[PDB]
Each structure stands twice: as structure tokens, then as C-alpha cells.
Amino acid sequence: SLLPVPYTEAASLSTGSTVTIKGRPLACFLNDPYLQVDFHTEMKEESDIVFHFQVCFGRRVVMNSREYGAWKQQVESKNMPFQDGQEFELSISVLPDKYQVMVNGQSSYTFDHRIKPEAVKMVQVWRDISLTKFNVSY
Amino acid sequence: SLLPVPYTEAASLSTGSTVTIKGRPLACFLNDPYLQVDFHTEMKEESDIVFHFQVCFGRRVVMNSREYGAWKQQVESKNMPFQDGQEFELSISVLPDKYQVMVNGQSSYTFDHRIKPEAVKMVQVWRDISLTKFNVSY
């Protein structure tokens, strides 16, 4: 859609920040499209990832961090509020102790901070979606 | 790059046909980009898949078919001739008994026919690549 994908934006986060994303999968769920949102420690795509959020639409969500180049403890959820063929609105709120992910207004995933959110310098949104809105509160 | 991704083209295949794809991953291998090539039985994206070829660059290749809407027996290979950050040339040749996948001129994967290649009506190339060339011999 309107915004380029992969989408990369410099960003700063702290308690009270919200990252809001509006988009739509590029394929029906039967084709297992992905969505990925990564909060990076530098502008470079190979930099460490404070928060990795990966949806396989219709299947599961995996969350992790990538520290000194290595993936850490994967977390998995089978919660799937995303609807086949539909636009979604995804909100990621920075709470004192965790990220909270809302999908279409419903609390759907959380992820305890492994690294301070202040380490984030960049957000990348990519894989099999079109993107119409991306916003970071400041 | 030049061709739209996801890329969809109507196609007919038989013994002696070759599908040639030139492209480049959109991310470094550390970010686990995917490439997927699906030979479909109809133009519709949800149609059955005679040959499903999915690369997770730097990790593995999975191959399968999707018959009457259900994924069948997955095959997996850890062969990884693709090079981090590089353009690749992918050739899929239709042999009497199998598909043969060449990567940068080297035989890299094969997949025995589960359904006659004559059932193919469409090829889709998608996931995390840019595409500069797509050709089906006729």
C-alpha cells in the first residue's frame, strides 16, 4: 500500500510510548503469510533486537530478542486475533515491565523487558504485509 | 526491484520446461528472510500447490505440496548454496520424475512429482525478495 515495506524508522521508546501499525496481509491465511516487527538497538538491520514480534497469520506468534547477534529464549503464543483477509491495527505499548501488544483494540500478547526500551533506536516492520500507517508517540 | 512481489504469472509446465528466477533477498541472512515459489493448480492464491519451495535463507529449505487445501508430507533440506547479501539465479527444471532446482548453476534440490506438472496453471514468487527476472520456457 502507501508505506514502503520493509519499513524502517528511527525511534526512541520509554514507558508510555506506543507504536501503532495499520496494515493488511498480502496473502490469505492458508498461504501462511508473516508479519514481523523488530525493535532494534541501531539503524543497521543486523543490529541487536530488543523485541522481536513475528506473526504467522492463522498459526502462531513468536517473540524473542537477539542479543550480541544470537537469538535468545523464544516465546510462543497460539492466540490469533487477526482475521483472514482483513486490515489490522496493531498497537505496542511500552509498560514499566513489559511490552503490551493490542490487536484491533484487544490485549493479545505481552513480553517482559529483557533490555531497557531506552536501548531502542529503530523499528522495522516487514514480511508479507502492506502498511498504511506507522506512528510512534513521543 | 523491477518486478512486483508477490509476483504471479499464468504458466503451463511439462517435461522439459524450466522456470528461471533472478532476485535478491531483502534482508541479511541474520534476519532470516524467506523466499517462496509455489506452482499452483489455478490462478487463485488459495488453490492447491503442486510444488511448494520455501527457502529460509541461511537456515533450510522446505518443500511440499498442498492438496485439497491440506499440506502434505514436508521435505526438508539443509543445503544452502545461497550467499548472504547476494543476487541469486534459481532454475526449476521439470524432469520426467521430479523437479530439479539449480541455484547459481549448481544442482541443489529435487522433488519427485506428486501430481503431474500438467496440472500447474500459475506460478507465484513471494516473501522477502526483490525480483529482476522471471521466465518460463515454452
Q: How was this structure determined?
A: X-ray
Nearest CA-CA partner of B120 in B105, B138, B132:
B138
Q: Is B13 helix (H, G, I), strand (E, B) or coil?
A: coil
* Distance, C-alpha A117 to centroid of its chain: 14
Domains and CATH numbers, chain B: 1-138 (2.60.120.200)
Q: What is the dihedral of CA A52, A9, B58, B129, to 10 degrees?
A: 130
Which contiguous run of DSSP H or E holds residue A137?
Answer: none
- Those residues of chain B whose CB sits closer than 8 Å to some CB in chain A are 6, 26-28, 30-31, 34, 38, 45-46, 66, 69, 126-128
**Contact yes or no for A34 and B34 at CB 8 A:** yes
Q: Scanning every residue of chain B, which has its alpha carbon at the shortest distance from the alpha carbon of A68?
A: B30
- Nearest CA distance, A116 vs chain B (angstrom): 22
Q: Scanning every residue of chain B, which has its alpha carbon at the shortest distance from the alpha carbon of A38?
A: B31
**DSSP β-bridge partners for residue B100:** B93, B110
Q: Which of B26, B31, B45 sits opposite A28 (nearest CB)?
A: B45
**Contact yes or no for A34 and B31 at CB 8 A:** no
* Distance, C-alpha A107 to centroid of its chain: 14
Residues of chain A in contact with residue B46, where contact means CB-CB under 8 angstroms, are 28, 30-31
**DSSP β-bridge partners for residue B22:** B89, B133
Residue A48 contacts residue A66 (beta carbons within 8 Å): yes
**Burial status of residue A62 (CB atoms within 10 A of its CB: 0-12, 13-18, 19 or more):** middle
Residue B25 contacts residue B57 (beta carbons within 8 Å): yes
Number of residue pairs across A and B with CB atoms under 8 Å?
36
Residues of chain B in contact with residue A28, where contact means CB-CB under 8 angstroms, are 45-46
Residues of chain B in contact with residue A38, where contact means CB-CB under 8 angstroms, are 31
Q: What angle is formed at CA B49 by the lines to CA B10 and CA B124, rounded to 5 degrees?
A: 40
State the amino acid at position B58 in one-letter form.
Answer: G
Q: Which of A30, A66, A128 sits opposite B46 (nearest CB)?
A: A30
Backbone φ and ψ for A82, nearest 5 degrees, come out as -65, 145
Cell of A47: 543490529
Distances, alpha carbon B31 to alpha carbons A9, A50, B10, B55, in Å:
17, 14, 31, 13
Which residues lie closer than 8 Å to B105 by C-beta, 6 or more apart?
B89
Chain B interface disruption, residue of A7, A62, A128, most B CBs within 10 A: A128
The DSSP secondary structure of B24-36, one letter per residue, reads: EESS-GGG--EEE
Alpha helices in chain B (DSSP H): none
State the amino acid at position A108 in one-letter form.
Answer: S
DSSP tally for chain A: helices H, then strands E: 0, 12
Residue B105 gets which letter from DSSP? Answer: T
Residue A29 contacts residue A84 (beta carbons within 8 Å): yes
Cell of A34: 508473516
**Contact yes or no for A28 and B6 at CB 8 A:** no
**Contact yes or no for B126 and A28 at CB 8 A:** no
**Contact yes or no for B45 and A34 at CB 8 A:** no
